[PDB]
Amino acid sequence: FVSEMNKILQMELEQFKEFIQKKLEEDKNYLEKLFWLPNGSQMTVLNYLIEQYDLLAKIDFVLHEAKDVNVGEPLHQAIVAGKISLALHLLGVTDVLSILSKVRKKIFFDVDKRDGYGRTLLSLALDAKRQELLIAILARNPIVHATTLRSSAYVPFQPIHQAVVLDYAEGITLLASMGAQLTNPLGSMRDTPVILAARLGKINALAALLELPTQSLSLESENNHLDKQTGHTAVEELCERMANENDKADALRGIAMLICRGAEPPRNEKMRNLLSSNRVAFLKAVSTYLADKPQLVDAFVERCHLSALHNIVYSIRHL
Amino acid sequence: FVSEMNKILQMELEQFKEFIQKKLEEDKNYLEKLFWLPNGSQMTVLNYLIEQYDLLAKIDFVLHEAKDVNVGEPLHQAIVAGKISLALHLLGVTDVLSILSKVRKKIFFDVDKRDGYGRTLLSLALDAKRQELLIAILARNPIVHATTLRSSAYVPFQPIHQAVVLDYAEGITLLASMGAQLTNPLGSMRDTPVILAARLGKINALAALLELPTQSLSLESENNHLDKQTGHTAVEELCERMANENDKADALRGIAMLICRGAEPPRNEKMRNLLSSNRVAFLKAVSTYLADKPQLVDAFVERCHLSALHNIVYSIRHL
Numbered sequence A, B: 001f002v003s004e005m006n007k008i009l010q011m012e013l014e015q016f017k018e019f020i021q022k023k024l025e026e027d028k029n030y031l032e033k034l035f036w037l038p039n040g041s042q043m044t045v046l047n048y049l050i051e052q053y054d055l056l057a058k059i060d061f062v063l064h065e066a067k068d069v070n071v072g073e074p075l076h077q078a079i080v081a082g083k084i085s086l087a088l089h090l091l092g093v094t095d096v097l098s099i100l101s102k103v104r105k106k107i108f109f110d111v112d113k114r115d116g117y118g119r120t121l122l123s124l125a126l127d128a129k130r131q132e133l134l135i136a137i138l139a140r141n142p143i144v145h146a147t148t149l150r151s152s153a154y155v156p157f158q159p160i161h162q163a164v165v166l167d168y169a170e171g172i173t174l175l176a177s178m179g180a181q182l183t184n185p186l187g188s189m190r191d192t193p194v195i196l197a198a199r200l201g202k203i204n205a206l207a208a209l210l211e212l213p214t215q216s217l218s219l220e221s222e223n224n225h226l227d228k229q230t231g232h233t234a235v236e237e238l239c240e241r242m243a244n245e246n247d248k249a250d251a252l253r254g255i256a257m258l259i260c261r262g263a264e265p266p267r268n269e270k271m272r273n274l275l276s277s278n279r280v281a282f283l284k285a286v287s288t289y290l291a292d293k294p295q296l297v298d299a300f301v302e303r304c305h306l307s308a309l310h311n312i313v314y315s316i317r318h319l
Helices: A002-008 A013-026 A045-051 A055-064 A074-080 A084-090 A096-105 A121-128 A131-138 A159-165 A169-177 A193-199 A203-210 A234-240 A245-260 A269-277 A281-289 A294-303 A309-313 B002-008 B013-026 B045-051 B055-064 B074-080 B084-090 B096-105 B121-128 B131-138 B159-165 B169-177 B193-199 B203-210 B234-240 B245-260 B269-277 B281-289 B294-303 B309-313
Strands: none
Touching (some): A002 A045, A013 A055, A045 A055, A045 A074, A055 A084, A074 A084, A074 A121, A084 A131, A096 A131, A121 A131, A121 A159, A159 A169, A159 A193, A159 A203, A169 A203, A193 A203, A193 A234, A193 A245, A203 A245, A234 A245, A234 A269, A245 A281, A245 A294, A269 A309, B002 B045, B013 B055, B045 B055, B045 B074, B074 B084, B074 B121, B084 B131, B096 B131, B096 B169, B121 B131, B121 B159, B131 B169, B159 B193, B169 B203, B193 B203, B193 B234, B193 B245, B203 B245, B234 B245, B234 B269, B245 B281
């Protein structure tokens, strides 16, 4: 019945509004009841409208005269199916912070609701890796601390963690402004977003994180990856990535990025020599990371004349 | 940090409010940020308070001065962990319909939100099989049509379907009053709640469904369990349960219940003889189901003198 009838709604605009208005008269709460499909799935009129992808103004009317619009989670299925333009329409919508404050200053759906798989709308927005949609959701003041289970181990992932693993630099820059937790770890190991980006080699996420104040990143703290009794830190965990030469180069970058922003060098002799043995390219990454950031040179060369960076490097200003 | 600190909150009441107020001053939106636990899980102050189970008034204060209380889904974890009294407290709370209209007339948390596993609050309330909690949730006007994936086949289950499979008669009587869909099928087979209760042998759910008007149950409609080209109906599907003698008796009841409420007898000769061959106990179930329901006798004996029930039974009033 639902399919055919809804398929028969491939008709005209005034006739659609009239017919569905007769359904509202016959059944109060008709646009919030879910209906059966030949496969066992259950949809509403709005859901079935979204699954077929003018249909727009009809969707906008169903939005306009419905007691609840979050029923069936239409925005979620719109993002999941990849209908980003449809999602930006449903949401009623250069320096990305200026953009966020802008479209926020250009001032229905509950941006905190989850779907049948327990995924927040922020999780979907980040997974899409689309600036427009993520800014459109963040502009509605959601909770950027709500967690969604990501792995097959069902790990609670916060939007900043998910943004790190996705290597979404712009997402980190956005979520950071909304007050995200940059010092909260993730998973069985105390992998802070810094250590998280360092371990998985997400360099762009590391650079996006380091743009924020270093005092709010906790570059000293260690996780649970363990000699014994003491655990790796973001720099050290990046050094463990150099044993895999296939992605050693990128690792160096991160290490440079960490040391240039003030992170202490590794404490293990071997790893220390690992930076000494390979190579001058560490200082090539320091020089390339210090081109547009001259406010770090004084601290870098200051530490370099002191206390293991002194021995690793050995002047330096001329590179 | 979180554990210890929160464990250190096993202190006193005024000191708790003062300390956590200092946290609110230091961090606006402190009661909505999730925090890491040694296992990888993430909780808030309210979540960690609920996981340990006076703690109450402290929980009530965290509720009182928090920007958002649905963050972390505390009511969901309260129901899942089995802390029913805690859930009834968080919700601020004989003929069950009179009870529902009562506690509704005795007039925060969003009763439509789902958790990390995509389960509505109604799904949890039904799974608990506790009248008090289910009435407490329904009294807040949720959407009784929101579906949650139940099986490992990830089938969308509506609260009336879930109530049927759970054999929750009181839940069916409650959800029916809230405007649930009694004629909407479920799953790959068009198993309406009537056919659903008939197939899985949920007799109490069938009796609860049949208390409602028969015109709104669609006892004639057939599913997709198929000779060929034509499919089983609730009565027929109940007859297929009699081939399994281990639960044949109950099946008879349902059949009686269906035929006494006006459902047509099976159309298959074999199954028809199956009712004739076994037994007079069909009429014992008719007589026991017609004791407190005399308004069905005239229609029953009327149909019995006509058109296959006439042949199956063969007067009848004296049983």
